[PDB]
Structure formats: C-alpha cells, structure tokens
RNA sequence: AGCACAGUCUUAACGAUGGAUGUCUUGGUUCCUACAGCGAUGAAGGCCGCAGCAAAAUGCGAUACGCAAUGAAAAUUGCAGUGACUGAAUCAUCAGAAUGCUGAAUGUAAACUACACCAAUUCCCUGGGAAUAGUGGUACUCCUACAGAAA
RNA sequence: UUGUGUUGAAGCGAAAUACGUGAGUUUUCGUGGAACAUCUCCCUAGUGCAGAUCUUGGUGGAAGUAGCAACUAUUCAAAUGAGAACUUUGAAGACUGAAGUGGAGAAGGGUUUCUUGUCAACUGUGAUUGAACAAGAGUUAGCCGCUCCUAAGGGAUAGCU
RNA sequence: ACGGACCAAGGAGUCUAGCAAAUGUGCAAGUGUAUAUGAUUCUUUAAACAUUUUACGCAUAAUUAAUG
RNA sequence: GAUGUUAGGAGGGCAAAUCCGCCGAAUUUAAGCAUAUAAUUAAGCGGAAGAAAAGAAAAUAACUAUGAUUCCUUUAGUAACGGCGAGUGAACAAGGACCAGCUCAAACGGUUAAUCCUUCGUUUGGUGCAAACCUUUCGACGGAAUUGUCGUUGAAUUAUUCCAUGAAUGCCUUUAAUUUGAGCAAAGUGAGCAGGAAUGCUUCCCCAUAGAGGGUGAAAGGCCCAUAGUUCUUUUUAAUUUAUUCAUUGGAAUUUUUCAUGUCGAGUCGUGUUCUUUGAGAUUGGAGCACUAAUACGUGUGAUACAUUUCACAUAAAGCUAAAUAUAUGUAGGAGACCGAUAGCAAACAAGUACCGUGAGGGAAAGAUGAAAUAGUACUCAGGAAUGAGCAAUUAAAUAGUACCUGAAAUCGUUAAGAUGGAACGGAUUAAGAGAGAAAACAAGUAAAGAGGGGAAU
C-alpha cells in the first residue's frame, strides 16, 4: 500500500524493481482467483492501484528527464512541445500580429490616441 | 412555442384505401408497436397539435402613451378616494386620512422592523396581519412553474 | 434571489439536491447545536460527524438523546445509538433521522472541526 | 376574393416562416448596448466616447432646409481651425477627405464650431507631468491642478449634439 | 336439516379486469444571456477491453468504473476488503502522467489481426550491463531550404 | 379579491324532500391521502365530442365455438417423480429403406455443443422433456483450409475531364 | 344508402401579415414617440417611466399619362 | 525541370444554426397551362469564422448638396417588372445603432539591398515550487533577392514644435470599478388539541438589507441548506503618485520659398451576340464566345436606344480592415400567464435503446409503494409447489405487498330483488314495491334543574 510521496525519492532502478515485484504479486493473486479461492480476492485491487501509482511516478520521472534533455534548442519532440489546439498553434504570435509596417509605426509614435478631457 | 418539427419528424404515409383502415398517414416498416400507427395529424397519438404555437404570436400590446398617462392619473385619483380603496380590499377602517401623507423621515428608515412598527402606528396593523395570513400555496400546476405561493397586495 | 446567476427554479433546486456530490451532501446534512454550544461558539449549525451526541426534536422519538453511530449521505439520514427497531424478520436496525429534526449536544472535535469553528468565528 | 375589400397584396407566397425575426430581445439588447457604452467610457477615463461631427445641410429639395451632423470635417475646415488632419483624428474630431466646400458661409460656420470645440477642450499630457505643446493643431498640455479642477466639473456633451 | 327451476335482461351492493381522472415531476419547451473549432501533437465516429464477486447504461484505457496533483476531507459499503484518529476512505477539481486497436488513416492491404521494406529497438547505472520479433518509420499533394545528377 | 384543508384536499363511485327550463351547480354517504378554490372583477388559452373504414390503449358477443386431420402405428411392463399417451429403460410390433429424419461438409445461423442443475413463462395437449431457464465447461494443426497466384472482374497510380 | 362491436383518453375555423366595417377608448388638424437614446431602471424589470436644454407613417387636397 | 523515408514545415477528416461560393429542381399559384410563380428556394457539392460576408467610392445626388461598409426605423408594398394575369418589387434621401482608416502597384532613392529568411548561437532581464513562458540586441555561416526586397507618398529648403531614443538616480502608492472562486451570514424547534409524524389549528413570542427556492415524517422567515448584506483573494483598467538629470542618432507634423506636373492596375473596360439573373424596362448584374480600347483635356456613372456638345460626381480593371448585425448547431447559465407521462424532444425510465428492414432507413413501449424497506412480508398451519389461511405480523394505512398512489368506463363474477309467449330500451301518466329522508312537511315561548358558553353594569 505504498503511496506517491514515498516513491518520488527512490531511484528509477529501484522503482522498476518494486514494480516488477508488484506485478508478480498481482499474477499470484490472479492465479489464486482462477483456482477455487475467495480468500485474497479483494486484496488484488489495492495491489493493482499501487502498481498504477508506481507506473505513474516512473512515467513522470521519465518525462522530467526528457524535458531536461530537450531544454530550448529551437525544435523539440512533438510530445514535449507545448500541446495546444491546432488552430492556436497555426495562429500567429501576438507580437507577430502587432508588428506594423515602419511608416505606420512612425505615425503611431507621432499621433497616439490622446486623452482630451472636454469641458 | 412548441418545437417546429413536433409530431412531423416521421416519414409516415397513408396506405391508401384498400387495406380496411382509416386513411391517416401510417408509420412504415415493422417490428415496433409504433410501426403501422397513425402518424401526424392532431387526432393521432404522437401527432402534431392543431395550430402549433409560434414565437411570432403577438405578445406585447402597444398602448397610447397618452392613454397610459390617463390610466395612471385615474389610478392615482382612485387611491386618493377612501371608498374606492376600501372596495379594492384594503383594511382602511382605522385610517384618518386616505390620501396618506407621511414625513420625509420615512425615506431614511433602514430596518424592516421599524417600517412595520410605523405601519402599525399608522393604523395598518390589520392590513399587515391580513398580508401575513395571505401567503398560501397556489391551486394548480403553477406550483411547478415557479409560482408556488400567492400573496395579496398591500 | 437578487443575484441572477443562481437559479430559483424549483425543479433545478430539486435536481441539485438529489444529485449533489458527496461533499455537498456532507455540507447540507448540518444540524443545530445546543444553546450552550451556540454561546460558546459564533456557530449556529455544524455538519454532523460520527461520535457526536445528539438530541432528537421531531418524529416519534421526540426527546431521546444519544450518540450517532453512522451518518448516511445517500439517504440523508443519521442513525442514533438507541433508536433501535426490529425489522419483519426480527433483525434490529437503527431508525434514520434527518439532521433537521435533530439538535446536537456533545461535539466530536478534530483539527478540521477546530479549523471550521475558527473560520466561523 | 369577395365583397368590397381591398385587393389582397400580402406577399407571403414564399416560405416566409423560414425568416421571421421577433425582437423579444429589443429592450434587453438596448440595455446591453448601454452597458457596453458605459464600460467604454470608463475605460477612456475622462475622455468622451463621442467624436466631433460637423453640422451639414441635407441634400435634395425636401431636406435642404434642415441641418444635421455629417461624418468628417474636410481638409479646408481643419486648415481654417488651424489643425492638421492627423492631429484632429488623434483628438476628438472626425475628418472627411472626400467632402468638399461650395458654401463659404457653411465653411465659416464649421470652422467656428471647431474653434469652439478647441476652446472647450483641455489636453492631458501624453507622459505624466511633462507639459509639452501639441503638434500642428493640438493645443497645449495644462498642469495637474487645472486638470483636477476640470475633472471635478461635469464633462459636457452639448457640442457633440 | 330444508327451500329456491334454469337461462336471458335490468337494478343496487360488494368485488375482478383495465389504467382513465386527480395529484405529483431529477424531463421537455421556447425565449434570453455568454461564449464557441476539433484534427497527422492522430479528431469526430466505430470496434475491443477494463470491477473481486460485474449484464446494460454510465466512467474510463493494458496505470483501464481509475493514477498523480490540488480543494475538501472520515468514511466506503450488498457482501468481501480498504482506510481515518491527514498526498491514504470518499467526493469535487483537473493543469501532470497516461490514452488498446482502428478511423482523414497516411507503408501495401482488408469478410485478412495478411503482408512488405528501412531502422534492430528499448531499459538500467555512472562507458558498461540487461533485455525483447518487440518498438519506431516509410501515403499523396505542396511549400521553403539543401543535396547531387540530367538538358 | 377572501377563503377551504390530515377533526382529510382534489379525484373517483353511488346518490340527494336539492337548485337551475338547461349546460350544470351544490350537497350527503363511501372511498381517497394532499392539495384546492373564486361567481368579486377580467384577463388568457393547445377550452367542452357519440361518430371522422378517427388515433392510442383496453375490453366484449361471436365462443369454450372453428379448430389442434401430410409424413402407414403403436402397445406392455418398469423407473424417475407431486403428477407421465408424448421423460428414461427393457420387451414387442413397426417405419425410414442407402436419391434415408444415415454419415460428412458449404452458405446462413452463433453458443444452438457438453455436464450438473432445473420448470415463472415458453416448449399452440401434458411434460418430470427440451434447441427454455441457471451455473459452469468446451473449439489445441508446419501437413485440414484460409494465408500465395491469377480468372471473370473491382479499387486505385499518371493523366485527362 | 354509407359510418358506427364497446369503453376510456386524445381529436378539428387557429395563429400571423396587411385591409374592412362594426363598436369601445385616448387624443383630435392632428395623431402614432419608429428605431434609438436617458435614467437614482434592474428578484419581478425582456416593463414601467422619460423623449433630447421640421425623423417618417397615415391624415390635412385634389387631379392629370404627363412638364405639372 | 525531375528526383530524394534529405532538413524544417503545411494541406486532407469530422462539426453547421448563423456564414460564404458554386450547382440547382419540382410540388405549388395562376381556379387549365406553356411565360411567369414556387425560387435566384430544397436537395447536391465545396469552403470559413466567433461571427462570416461587406467595406474606404470609376457612390448618390441635382441640393444651400451629401460622403467606406453593415444593421435597424423608414422610403414602400412605392418607382418598376409581370399571358401588364397570378403575382413580384428595389434604390436615393431622412431618423438612428456604430463609427476607422488604410498599403500595395506605379513616381522617387544606385557615393552600391538601405531588405528578408533557415540553422548555430551569444547575455541582460521579468514571472512560476517546478514545467514553462515572456521579452532584450548581437553577430556569424548559409541562402532568397537586380525578372526588384526595403525606405519615401512628389522633391528640396526654411522657421516652429513634438515624438522615438539610451544611462544614472527615482517611485511603485491610494482607491473606484469589473469579473472569478470563497467564507461569514438575523430570529421558536414555546403552551394546549388532534395526529404515525407538523411545517396545522388556537395562543405567547421574535427576525427581517434575509417572507426567492429547495429540503425536512402534512402548508416553516425563525429546523437545515441556501437568500439579503458584507469581508477577503482572482481577472483587468481607469483615475490618482514621482519623476529628475545627462548623450546624440533618427523621424514627424505644420510653415516659408523654390521646381515637378509626375503617377494613377489591359484580352481589362467596353461593344456585338448568346444564356442566365434582376424591379432594370432598345438588357441590372453575371457569364461564354467574337471583336478589343483610351491615358486623366483620359473613361466610367448621372435608370429610353442614338448622334453632336455641356456640366456634375467619381477615379474600375490589385489588397487589407474593428465596431454595430445573425445564430433551429454545441456547451454552459438564467426564464416562462408554456407542456404535465396518449402532453412535452422520438426519448422524464439501461432512447436514438429494444425491435424491424439486404440496405438507404424506419423506430417504440415503458414514471409514481411508504415518512421510513436501516419497516419488502417473520412465524405457525395446509399444500409437490405455487399460493392460501391464520388465534399470527411490519405499518398510520397492506383492498399501500413490489404488475405496489388515486383505480373510472367497457367487460366479467357473487349476492339480492325483480321481470320474461319472436327483441330490448324509451316518452307521457299512474302503480305497487324497495330504498332514502325531516332543512316547509306541527308546537314559539313559559316553568321547574342539569351541562355549558357569552356580553354588560359597577
Ligand atoms: Mg408531441
Ligand atoms: Mg387542477
Ligand atoms: Mg331464474
Ligand atoms: Mg489520488
Ligand atoms: Mg488531499
Ligand atoms: Mg495503413
Ligand atoms: Mg483475402
Ligand atoms: Mg376543481
Ligand atoms: Mg383543440
Ligand atoms: Mg369517444
Ligand atoms: Mg356529431
Ligand atoms: Mg382499436
Ligand atoms: Mg408436442
Ligand atoms: Mg419399409
Ligand atoms: Mg414406404
Ligand atoms: Mg442425425
Ligand atoms: Mg443439448
Ligand atoms: Mg404446453
Ligand atoms: Mg440438460
Ligand atoms: Mg440459454
Ligand atoms: Mg494443404
Ligand atoms: Mg502480387
Ligand atoms: Mg483482370
Ligand atoms: Mg473507377
Ligand atoms: Mg359515400
Ligand atoms: Mg360497419
Ligand atoms: Mg371506429
Ligand atoms: Mg375528450
Ligand atoms: Mg374604428
Ligand atoms: Mg476539409
Ligand atoms: Mg444554373
Ligand atoms: Mg395550376
Ligand atoms: Mg386547382
Ligand atoms: Mg441547400
Ligand atoms: Mg472553422
Ligand atoms: Mg472580414
Ligand atoms: Mg433599407
Ligand atoms: Mg405608404
Ligand atoms: Mg422573385
Ligand atoms: Mg402525506
Ligand atoms: Mg485607376
Ligand atoms: Mg427570373
Ligand atoms: Mg441619379
Ligand atoms: Mg475583404
Ligand atoms: Mg411520450
Ligand atoms: Mg391519519
Ligand atoms: Mg383502496
Ligand atoms: Mg400519494
Ligand atoms: Mg393500486
């Protein structure tokens, strides 16, 4: 019945080892269930949950390392890329949208939309 | 308004004359209890209603501004007149003057309790009591359309 | 009422009541605390837990005090120590009382409860 | 058709039901619009949400006598006012490149109006405190106290009508 | 212990049959408001699964009626089992992880779990040591850049 | 607007020295178990049914009637069981008569197969039987096929429309 | 002659556009505040109120193919 | 030009209510029908967005002229079209909503592409626990580009004044709102009656910026959730506060005076002809084909073809652009003088489900016990069993027993009464029965004495 916060500290190899053990345990439980038994039939669920948790932890760890590896460097694996709606991705960056022609920019600089309190 | 395609979403058609059944359109195919049954038509289970209600019915009624003003004036006059007020159902047996005028101090009252007290002092105690009594559960299906209680107008 | 974001609609309200999540159920199964308790804390009503001792005001047993054995969020009923009743078979089960019909005296107090009290204050 | 009634001219031979708009939303729509306007005003702190339009005479033999707000001031009028078009645009005034003057009197009137508007208006500096004179047409930036005083007074919308 | 003929029809009482009426109502309905694209980063749709005792629906995806994390916060319960005395039992939220096979389906195919070819691929530890026939990729059109050939 | 309700509302069934020319209204008893009125005025409507070979759902007379007549045909004893003409076993007598209700397969079906149960309904009679219901269980290939090839053909590549 | 075995529920001149006369009402050579704005309007408030510190409709004039 | 599983990328499909193109009918109306009408509609196919499309005048007007589109009110059922039949049918103005303008091409700049992009980088910042973003300027190595990128919007030259700039020191305050999630949140669980149980009926209290609504064993402001109101935090966006110094590169608007009269979109407009579309009429737009222009003194509108000439207004044949406006689709809220299980979506329920159809498709029926099944029928007897019965049993109530609220009618059963010679029923008028009944169908008051209730006088 191991929980997440205990597993974050453990090295990856150790985690893997734990996972395999859990799997083995689960297998045993399954076997028992298959045979004419109902003694530990309810224990299996917990084990499964634990296994899942372990997997999640390991996956997260893997992801983190991957992220670390691919820091910056322009292009990145599409998974590590900021996954967002396709349309949004397609869409120009706000800066790009803003970017006016030089003359226009100059004009803007010259005569901005001033505030002109009327009394 | 009833939905636009209500009762008419069916492909049902009439079998014609020589099958020994009325000539209302009939649901096609088989297997279902619905198959073979009368389709649309106001008389048919699951049919469309007669003249289905529509959003374009005239709901509001324009009234001459002048007419409205006149009505308002009349109402005001009625309110002034003690007898009329009495008739309308308000318990006015204990009020000196029925054009009721009270000091500007009222506009500044901050507490419902205080207001109630003031009312009582005026002579409307009976009226207040009546009002209290008269919150009652409506007869009918109104109960189910956010009109649960009925309350008389004070 | 005055805020037009929350529905008054009766049907909607009923739906909400019936289909409320567990937390919501817990929240709405609150009970009035005794006069002394009220005096002690700025709280008027608390969500009843397990080891709270309650006194029943409404129903057939309108004065029988006792600790709560179990609370049931599925049926909105709490079960007291000695509100026992035999079924048809003869099996003894607790009579379920709605938290509205009950006023709590002795309070089960954990850190969470303390926090809640503080918040209320 | 029967009896002495007018001959029926109700054009409902097309699938008209397919295109009926009932404006249940009228009053509410109006309210929404008002709210939006208010919001805009708030955003544009102090400044008036409305832009200056010149008075102009309506076309055709039948509306000739009447005068109404036209969109945009015409270069000539701007010049008369002593203002650049761009500057005018930046401030409260609409400019109209396409409009032309054939009435000297009208032009004069327009320029008078412009002058009046200018007189009315006080210009908040672009950067805080730093009081600097305008470009081409734009008047001057007043001090802080004056601005405050102006704010304290009610912003009139008499010119924009 | 006796006594009514029987049947057909009628009336009344009390029943059957049926589900009308009445009363409800977690549904609909129209209107109003508000926002409003998902997809080769593999969508919608469809299969296949997944629970201890598990059909459907609901929920989810080989971590499979849920994982992590956050906010609550002692229960969950048909039984079995699991927890409290707060990352744990249960909700809610959901941003992280994960997301079978398919399907635009995109290697060629398709009443196939058929078949190619190019990478062997993957994980562990701080360059070795383990693994698995397993995992990727390879469509058509196009664009920019590059490449080396053609005229 | 001014009221009736768990000392029982609406509804329903029977009525009533009841009222109304009449639609109806009102009341009593019985059931019922929660709402109900307005005639004070008027406002609004998906507002009143005996018919439409009306729609839907129900129910009759017909009527315990027609009928349960292809495939030559059963009988005795015993067993199981609450109960046996149609479950099982034995003994007869019979038929199918290798162009077979026999073996295998294909299409189609999809667990109908098998064992242990077993009878609410179904098995147009009965039924303890069952292709029913319930619980399980069962289909093992290098050689038998598919998988490969081409056929009539099909879907596409280049184009061109 | 047709429809109706029986019973229960459902089941059919409605709604909008413009015109008409009838009658009610307000105002009346005028009338209707259209959109839209404004508010110390915001459960009801999608209504009610208000109408800018010569809008348009119909009517007030007819007639003629017509410049008129 | 091919070619590449080269490096980096994009398109395909789903979804449609509004939206934009295409393509495209017929029923129908004309009391027939053929032009018309339906209708530039449905279906078909293709494409977008939160809106789309339209849009910055080759516009209208003929005025004292207006000044991009869009949308609303209106013009207007008007001009017009139409077997001048049925029918159809705009636009300008006017009042509003909202208001926003622009940049390519061409002219100019060669004492020089001043541009642009891929890849590899380099170092100051700001947030966040991370993940990540957010910006800052600077060069390489490539390319692209002279078949043309970028600057300028005629060109200089004067006066005026702004705007960018960079560094030091400097401050980050007070509120108003606006929008998310949050808490907190007034006062009876008082007698008595009846009840299974008050939230009821009396009566004594109160609270209300909360008497919306829901729950709770019957109608509850005071039992609970919530509600009125506030106290934070979230979203941004106004106002207020603190800017001060030094460096110069660049630019802009006017304003003088010179000099330059530039440029302004071609198989395009236009005409002829065909078909379509239009209210468009000797053709409104569009399209196919044939012919095929003019340079701003141009050429295109100015609703009758044409010639000769005025005049007014525009500047076509390149492009972009917010606002108002529309939404029967999807999700999420809020509503109703709406519907109340044959109604309302087809679907209140394991409904687009079962089931039917080879298939395209078609497509149901089906809600309610009670307050509480943590009261779902214990036990005994008879039964093969179902069931039944109980002296038994849960309930307030089982003729509330899960086919469960109420339980109508048809139909059928039991009992009783009656009637009965090939119908029955009915109306009119009695009759005998059999039920019902007393509020007109007799008895006010007076007296003796019980049980209650009142009101008043002092
Ligand atoms: Mg319907
Ligand atoms: Mg009713
Ligand atoms: Mg007899
Ligand atoms: Mg967790
Ligand atoms: Mg937690
Ligand atoms: Mg493939
Ligand atoms: Mg094959
Ligand atoms: Mg009634
Ligand atoms: Mg009707
Ligand atoms: Mg009938
Ligand atoms: Mg009739
Ligand atoms: Mg029938
Ligand atoms: Mg048989
Ligand atoms: Mg033989
Ligand atoms: Mg033979
Ligand atoms: Mg055989
Ligand atoms: Mg068998
Ligand atoms: Mg049988
Ligand atoms: Mg068997
Ligand atoms: Mg079976
Ligand atoms: Mg072989
Ligand atoms: Mg081959
Ligand atoms: Mg071939
Ligand atoms: Mg082909
Ligand atoms: Mg006939
Ligand atoms: Mg007949
Ligand atoms: Mg019939
Ligand atoms: Mg009826
Ligand atoms: Mg009239
Ligand atoms: Mg597409
Ligand atoms: Mg065509
Ligand atoms: Mg015709
Ligand atoms: Mg005809
Ligand atoms: Mg279409
Ligand atoms: Mg799109
Ligand atoms: Mg656009
Ligand atoms: Mg218009
Ligand atoms: Mg007119
Ligand atoms: Mg037309
Ligand atoms: Mg009740
Ligand atoms: Mg041009
Ligand atoms: Mg046409
Ligand atoms: Mg004109
Ligand atoms: Mg455009
Ligand atoms: Mg229905
Ligand atoms: Mg009772
Ligand atoms: Mg009963
Ligand atoms: Mg009931
Ligand atoms: Mg019943």
């Amino acid at each position: 019945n191991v929980k997440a916060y205990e597993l974050r500290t453990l090295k990856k190899k150790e985690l893997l080892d734990k996972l395999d053990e859990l799997k083995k345990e689960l297998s045993g439980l399954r076997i028992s269930k298959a045979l004419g038994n109902s003694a530990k039939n309810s224990k299996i669920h917990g084990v499964r949950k634990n296994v899942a948790r372990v997997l999640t932890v390991y996956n997260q760890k893997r992801k983190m390392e991957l992220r670390q590896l691919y820091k910056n460097k322009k292009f990145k694996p599409y998974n590590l890329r900021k996954k967002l709606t396709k349309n949004k991705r397609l869409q120009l960056s706000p800066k790009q949208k803003a970017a006016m022609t030089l003359r226009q920019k100059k004009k803007v600089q010259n005569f901005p939309q001033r505030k002109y309190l009327v009394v | 308004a009833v939905k636009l395609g209500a009762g008419y979403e069916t492909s049902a058609e009439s079998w014609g004359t020589g099958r020994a059944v009325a000539r209302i359109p009939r649901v096609p195919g088989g297997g279902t209890h619905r198959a073979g049954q009368g389709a649309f038509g106001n008389m048919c289970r699951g049919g469309g209603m007669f003249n289905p209600t529509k959003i374009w019915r005239r709901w509001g009624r324009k009234v001459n501004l002048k007419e409205k003003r006149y009505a308002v004036c009349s109402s005001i006059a009625a309110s002034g007149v003690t007898s009329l007020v009495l008739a309308r159902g308000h318990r006015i047996s204990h009020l000196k003057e029925v054009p009721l005028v009270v000091s500007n101090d009222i506009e500044s009252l901050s507490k419902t309790k205080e207001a109630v007290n003031f009312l009582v002092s005026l002579g409307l105690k009976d009226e207040v009591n009546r009002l209290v009594k008269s919150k009652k559960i409506r007869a009918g299906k109104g109960k189910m359309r956010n009109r649960k209680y009925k309350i008389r107008n004070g | 009422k005055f805020n037009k974001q929350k529905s008054s609609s009766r049907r909607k309200m009923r739906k909400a009541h019936f289909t409320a999540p567990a937390g919501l159920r817990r929240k709405i199964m609150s009970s009035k605390l005794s006069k002394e308790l009220r005096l002690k804390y700025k709280t008027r009503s608390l969500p009843v837990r397990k080891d709270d001792e309650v006194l029943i005001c409404r129903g057939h047993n309108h004065g029988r005090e006792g600790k709560v054995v179990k609370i049931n969020r599925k049926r909105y009923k709490i079960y007291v120590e000695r509100v026992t009743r035999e079924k048809v078979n003869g099996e003894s089960t607790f009579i379920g009382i709605h938290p509205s019909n009950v006023v709590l005296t002795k309070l089960k107090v954990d850190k969470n409860r303390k926090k809640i009290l503080d918040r209320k204050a | 058709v029967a009896h002495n009634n007018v001959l029926p001219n109700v054009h409902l031979h097309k699938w008209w039901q397919h295109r009926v708009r009932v404006n249940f939303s009228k009053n509410i729509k109006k309210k929404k619009r008002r709210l939006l306007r208010e919001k805009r005003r708030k955003a544009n702190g102090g400044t008036p949400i409305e832009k200056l339009h010149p008075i102009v005479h309506c076309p055709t033999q039948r509306y000739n006598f009447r005068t109404r707000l036209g969109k945009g001031f015409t270069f000539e009028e701007l010049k008369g006012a002593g203002l650049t078009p761009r500057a005018a645009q930046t401030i409260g005034i609409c400019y109209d490149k396409r409009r032309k003057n054939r009435s000297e009197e009208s032009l004069t009137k327009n320029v008078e109006r412009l002058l009046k508007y200018k007189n009315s208006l006080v210009m908040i500096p672009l950067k805080k405190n730093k009081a600097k004179k305008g470009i081409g047409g734009i008047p001057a930036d007043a001090d802080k106290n004056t601005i405050k005083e102006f704010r304290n007074k009610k912003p009139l919308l008499s010119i924009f009508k």
Side-chain angles (χ1 to χ4, degrees):
Chain A
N1 302 264
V2 196
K3 281 132 203 172
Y5 71 99
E6 303 165 46
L7 300 163
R8 266 86 161 90
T9 321
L10 286 158
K11 216 142 204 172
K12 284 195 271 79
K13 185 191 174 182
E14 281 85 298
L15 212 55
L16 242 49
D17 290 6
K18 193 82 165 288
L19 165 65
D20 289 310
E21 186 192 47
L22 263 50
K23 281 193 174 182
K24 278 190 275 290
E25 193 188 338
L26 201 79
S27 300
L29 266 309
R30 266 154 193 182
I31 299 164
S32 297
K33 179 189 168 180
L35 210 142
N37 293 126
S38 186
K40 327 97 177 182
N41 272 227
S42 42
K43 190 85 78 67
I44 191 264
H45 162 82
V47 180
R48 196 162 62 94
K49 250 57 191 175
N50 196 195
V51 170
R53 257 108 81 166
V54 168
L55 222 313
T56 302
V57 172
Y58 175 71
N59 279 193
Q60 280 178 316
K61 282 201 91 287
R62 295 292 276 98
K63 265 278 180 177
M64 211 66 71
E65 83 172 305
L66 207 71
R67 231 151 269 267
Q68 284 160 228
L69 204 152
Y70 286 99
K71 209 166 189 291
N72 306 314
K73 296 183 283 177
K74 188 72 91 285
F75 17 83
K76 218 179 288 179
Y78 289 89
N79 322 122
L80 295 165
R81 275 198 165 101
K82 191 184 181 71
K83 177 156 185 174
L84 203 65
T85 148
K86 182 195 176 69
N87 188 46
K88 252 61 187 176
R89 301 198 303 244
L90 284 162
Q91 209 86 212
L92 316 97
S93 59
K95 184 266 172 71
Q96 211 158 233
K97 281 186 178 180
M100 286 179 181
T101 179
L102 183 267
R103 51 160 50 196
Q104 201 167 323
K105 187 186 77 179
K106 282 195 178 300
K107 175 207 195 83
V108 167
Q109 285 172 239
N110 279 304
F111 308 97
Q113 212 70 34
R114 300 186 74 179
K115 296 200 172 188
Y116 50 89
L117 204 289
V118 180
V119 160
Chain B
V2 179
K3 80 105 82 282
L4 301 159
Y8 288 85
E9 284 168 32
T10 58
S11 55
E13 271 201 17
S14 64
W15 291 330
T17 40
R19 294 208 204 183
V21 210
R23 54 253 285 271
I24 309 176
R26 304 274 165 178
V27 167
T32 74
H33 294 276
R34 230 296 183 202
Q37 288 187 341
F40 23 88
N42 49 303
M43 79 283 276
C44 298
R45 181 210 161 95
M49 55 169 288
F50 168 50
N51 184 56
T53 55
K54 318 294 269 185
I55 53 158
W56 59 68
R57 177 197 272 102
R58 51 209 286 270
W59 305 100
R61 298 288 190 277
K62 176 201 150 195
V63 207
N64 302 11
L65 215 153
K66 284 179 180 175
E67 277 188 54
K68 287 173 169 180
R69 281 174 166 172
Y70 194 130
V72 166
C73 288
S74 25
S75 73
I76 291 163
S79 77
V81 180
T82 91
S83 63
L84 291 182
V85 184
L86 269 162
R88 206 218 155 272
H90 304 276
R91 319 282 180 178
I92 263 197
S93 56
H94 291 280
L95 280 166
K96 294 171 185 176
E97 191 73 46
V98 169
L100 265 169
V101 200
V102 180
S103 59
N104 289 162
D105 299 324
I106 192 181
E107 290 178 23
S108 62
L109 286 166
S110 60
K111 283 208 167 189
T112 57
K113 186 187 178 182
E114 291 176 38
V116 165
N117 194 236
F118 149 80
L119 287 161
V120 166
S121 76
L122 279 188
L124 289 179
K125 183 200 282 180
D126 197 298
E127 173 88 331
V128 104
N129 185 44
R130 147 200 145 102
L131 286 162
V132 166
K133 196 73 184 178
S134 63
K135 195 176 183 181
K136 280 201 174 188
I137 299 92
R138 258 198 193 86
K141 302 168 187 177
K143 299 191 214 214
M144 295 184 284
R145 299 172 192 190
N146 304 344
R147 297 185 299 270
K148 192 189 189 291
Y149 291 96
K150 200 172 190 176
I151 312 157
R152 294 173 209 168
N153 280 359
Chain C
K1 184 187 181 186
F2 272 75
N3 71 114
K4 295 162 82 178
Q5 289 292 317
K6 187 167 279 183
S7 60
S8 180
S9 44
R10 171 193 202 278
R11 162 164 73 102
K12 206 92 78 180
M13 213 95 276
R14 218 167 189 272
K15 190 184 177 179
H17 182 267
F18 273 96
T19 199
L24 274 182
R25 252 97 183 272
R26 168 209 144 268
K27 199 169 188 178
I28 68 176
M29 281 183 72
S30 297
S31 301
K32 173 175 267 290
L33 28 144
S34 299
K35 293 283 179 180
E36 174 68 45
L37 272 86
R38 205 166 187 269
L39 201 147
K40 206 170 177 181
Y41 327 111
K42 207 177 182 178
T43 308
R44 151 165 275 203
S45 183
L46 273 158
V48 70
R49 282 183 70 172
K50 194 182 178 181
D51 296 326
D52 303 63
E53 197 168 315
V54 295
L55 171 74
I56 315 160
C57 288
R58 313 285 92 169
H60 187 266
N61 35 242
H62 53 78
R64 295 179 78 257
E65 197 187 33
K67 285 180 75 183
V68 179
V69 185
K70 195 203 285 183
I71 69 102
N72 194 22
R73 290 175 176 99
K74 287 281 181 180
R75 302 176 205 270
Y76 294 96
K77 282 180 172 69
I78 69 159
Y79 304 94
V80 187
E81 276 276 61
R82 275 176 285 272
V83 290
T84 180
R85 163 168 178 159
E86 289 182 45
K87 305 204 289 284
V88 182
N89 309 120
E91 188 72 39
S92 297
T93 44
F94 313 99
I95 296 161
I97 308 101
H98 196 271
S100 157
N101 301 342
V102 88
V103 57
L104 70 294
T105 318
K106 269 193 166 69
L107 187 75
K108 170 73 171 181
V109 56
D110 281 49
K111 197 176 182 179
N112 293 36
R113 300 305 296 270
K114 284 183 178 70
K115 182 192 174 183
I116 291 160
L117 261 58
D118 288 12
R119 201 176 68 181
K120 262 140 179 176
Chain D
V1 63
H3 305 91
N4 194 24
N5 308 305
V6 169
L7 290 323
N9 201 238
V10 193
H11 293 60
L12 295 180
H13 292 252
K14 304 182 191 191
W15 184 31
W16 63 273
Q17 297 95 184
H18 183 51
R19 281 156 271 92
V20 163
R21 288 222 238 97
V22 197
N23 209 193
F24 303 116
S25 178
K26 197 192 93 288
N27 217 120
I28 199 156
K29 197 166 73 179
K30 161 253 201 165
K31 182 186 169 179
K32 181 202 83 177
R33 281 199 305 269
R34 251 197 57 90
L35 257 68
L36 203 148
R37 111 178 68 256
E38 212 286 321
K39 189 168 72 68
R40 202 182 162 207
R41 194 186 287 105
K42 196 151 267 71
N44 280 121
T47 134
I49 6 87
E50 300 166 45
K51 279 198 171 181
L52 194 70
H53 295 284
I55 37 179
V56 295
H57 284 274
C58 321
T60 217
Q61 173 259 19
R62 104 184 193 113
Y63 293 111
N64 200 190
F65 44 70
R66 269 156 48 83
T67 314
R68 49 95 179 182
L69 305 100
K71 69 140 282 186
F73 263 95
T74 310
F75 180 77
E76 286 275 58
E77 290 158 41
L78 270 68
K79 281 277 281 291
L83 266 145
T84 308
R86 304 264 279 272
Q89 281 200 32
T90 233
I91 326 161
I93 138 173
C94 295
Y95 155 78
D96 198 278
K97 45 179 272 288
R98 23 173 53 92
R99 188 175 156 259
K100 294 154 78 180
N101 293 76
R102 278 85 53 166
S103 283
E104 193 179 314
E105 298 158 40
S106 182
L107 189 148
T108 58
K109 187 167 67 181
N110 279 308
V111 300
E112 186 75 38
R113 183 188 175 94
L114 253 159
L115 258 62
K116 185 187 176 181
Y117 177 76
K118 206 92 154 290
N119 200 48
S120 183
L121 145 156
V122 70
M123 212 79 182
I124 305 161
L126 195 72
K127 288 183 179 180
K128 285 194 174 183
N129 300 51
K130 290 181 180 180
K132 285 178 177 182
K133 285 90 80 179
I135 333 151
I138 311 161
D141 293 343
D143 52 294
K144 269 190 161 181
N145 300 313
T146 45
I147 282 168
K148 282 186 176 180
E149 181 195 43
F150 277 115
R151 285 188 185 271
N152 291 144
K153 289 183 179 181
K154 191 182 180 180
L156 52 89
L157 298 159
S158 186
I159 326 159
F160 303 101
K161 286 185 177 181

